Design a binder for this molecule. Sequence first.
Ligand SMILES: N[C@H]1[C@H](Oc2ccc([N+](=O)[O-])cc2)O[C@H](CO)[C@@H](O)[C@@H]1O
Length: 850
Amino acid sequence: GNATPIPGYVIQSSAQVSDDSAVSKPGFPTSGWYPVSSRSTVYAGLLQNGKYADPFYSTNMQNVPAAQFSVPWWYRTDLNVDDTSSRTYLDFSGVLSKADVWVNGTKVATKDQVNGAYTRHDLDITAQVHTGVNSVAFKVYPNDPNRDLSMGWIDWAQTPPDQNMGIVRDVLVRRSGAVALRSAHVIQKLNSALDHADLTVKADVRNDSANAVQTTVAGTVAGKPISQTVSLAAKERKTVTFPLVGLDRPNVWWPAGMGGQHRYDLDLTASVGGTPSDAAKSKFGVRDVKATLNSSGGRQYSVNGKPLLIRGGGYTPDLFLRWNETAAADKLKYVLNLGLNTVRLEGHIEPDEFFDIADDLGVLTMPGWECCDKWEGQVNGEEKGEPWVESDYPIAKASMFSEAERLRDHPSVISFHIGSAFAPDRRIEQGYLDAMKAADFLLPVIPAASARPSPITGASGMKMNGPYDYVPPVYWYDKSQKDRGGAWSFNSETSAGVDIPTMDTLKRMMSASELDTMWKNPSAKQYHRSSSDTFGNLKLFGDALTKRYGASANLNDFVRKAQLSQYENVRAEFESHSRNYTDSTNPSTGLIYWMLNSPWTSLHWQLFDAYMDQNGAYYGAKKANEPLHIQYSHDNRSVVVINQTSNAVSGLTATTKLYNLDGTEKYSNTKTGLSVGALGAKATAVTVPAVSGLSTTYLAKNVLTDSSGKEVSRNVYWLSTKADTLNWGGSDWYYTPQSAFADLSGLNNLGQSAVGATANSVAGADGTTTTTVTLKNTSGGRLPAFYVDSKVVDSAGKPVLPVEWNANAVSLWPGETTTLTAKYRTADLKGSKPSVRISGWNTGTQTVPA
Ligand SMILES: N[C@H]1[C@H](Oc2ccc([N+](=O)[O-])cc2)O[C@H](CO)[C@@H](O)[C@@H]1O
């Protein structure tokens, strides 16, 4: 019943190994080999040892010779075996791209068999294993994402020098008797009332001994005892199906905010001769999911019978696939701190623990294959990725079986994308559907994340029309352009491009001269944007920032304007889709922001940066996604209330006020007695009229109060009397140019205000600290304290990260007070007392003790 991951390896280039057979012989010398932990790419292993500077800074990654990664590298380990009575197996996946496998001088598997990142291998090495010191070695071949059914980085970042070659999941050493237990899972089916489920337990037993046996498979499913006895011929594998098990009042799994995140346990042992031979423990959730096309042709998800608007981001692992379990949890927790409900994984499908965490937190996941490389090479024409040859087909199908077997019992998974870009052809699709059936993977299959249909499954119900680069806030409210990215159908991957991180992050990833070029010449190429020619620079972003904000006087000026622009755009992107969700015709049914995060330190396509810091894009997404939310429509000036929560809400008041930048109120409307339905429904409070006398740049202050009088949402917009307008005829695949630009440059001369700050911290018994900050606009005039950003810092003024605030980037009118709460691990203070840095657009910067 043992399965123990190999904790580490020593690695070296095959340039240093003239005899392959020598490596896995006990006693082979490994002087100058690099010790690496489990789940290391070659380059990640070299970084672990010294060997190159931080690729997260400047052009360090460019200085790595890539030629050394065009030959195989060895991953070698010893294994102590005290007792060879039990059979021994190597059970693994995550090999990029393929490998020969050696035990004690014998090649047990070749790169023709061990091939493809997602394929699982269960190699019986019993005949090679002896008592005492054994040795195992993998010769890992170079990875080319265009040639290998593997992982590549598309245009998200820059290419890792080793192209991620290595072993990026665990290799398990399994020990068992005559019978191996494998692939234990639970088929679960809930009634529509959600008060009764039926559980079908299935498990494979394989008799690897020389003689026929009887084996009993027995244990517990969801607290209920189960047992089957089968006969097995020598070398026979069988799937055991247990009689149906009913479960009353099941603890149903819900997405975060809709109920609990319970998972039941499955615990089985296969016994031979009244003695345990092998054992397996797993979990599953009792949850129904569906994803169907609505009458308008949009893909509509529902969980447990409740339709949902998908509100998420494209998730990526680290650029060098460096795995850390706490980091994965910190990233999924930020999803909820954002108010988001979903992450999409375009390829790069994370180890099991990532899905365990998403299960435990109630974050929905959308895994699938990626575009623009080998996966779509048979159907994607002139795009990157090679045509398929006959040997490709069984690798892809085994990759599908393996991932379907891994993912089937994680309730967070709401679908699998079998295509991205292009839907698979009939042959490929059939092999994917066959593999999923064989795995009992019963979740929705989506053919493409674009509008392209597959021959069997059919219409995707999704769109990939862009944009991926600057478009003004009003763009997102478009429904008229059927080949563009407005708020209708399922937006599977879209953003307004550039997302300048915080200054603290900037100073860690770029030199002073790289930063100087960034603000002085946005048209210049930035290594920390993209290898793509199209996304190599920040020109569209820089042009609109100047036009709309005003020319940047310095680096500080550029970064501050970037944050407002990013907050403004990301907010409108999400808010437009929340609004249109309940449209009768062509509703929005999903939005995946491109992207949630970056593989590395980046200037684009992120909400949170590589260090987990939180900028304007972060705060703007968090504002748009709050559970009871008030918002302003950029297209028609409607003020709209959204209720994300699982219950209808009544007696809400929506209060909207316009102010000139001198603080003069120019309009007020108070709309009382609003009711809004659950799970994404809306109510319109008012349409703001054209108001005479507004400054060119003006403020809209929107406030939602419940029936108790509590303020539950505040949303402040900086607006212009001059419209952003689109030149739709100049549209390209990744953006639409503007025919005219809003004028928000009035903010440059917004007069100074004042805050107003007191902070205190409590170190909890759960290992976390909560810092509470009370901020007040203490000025003596009519000016708001606008866009006030509070940051937990140590004594050196460095941000404590990760961190989760209840609210931030707040605006307060004179005399107004807000109390804010930040939570973080006490240990991330690293012994420092906490302080709070408070910076506002028109309030300066101060830091206070906490
Ligand atoms: N799925 C990818 C998406 O792929 C596309 C392929 C073709 C078209 N097209 O021809 O309109 C549009 C998008 O492109 C994004 C931006 O380049 C990538 O970052 C995503 O990973």
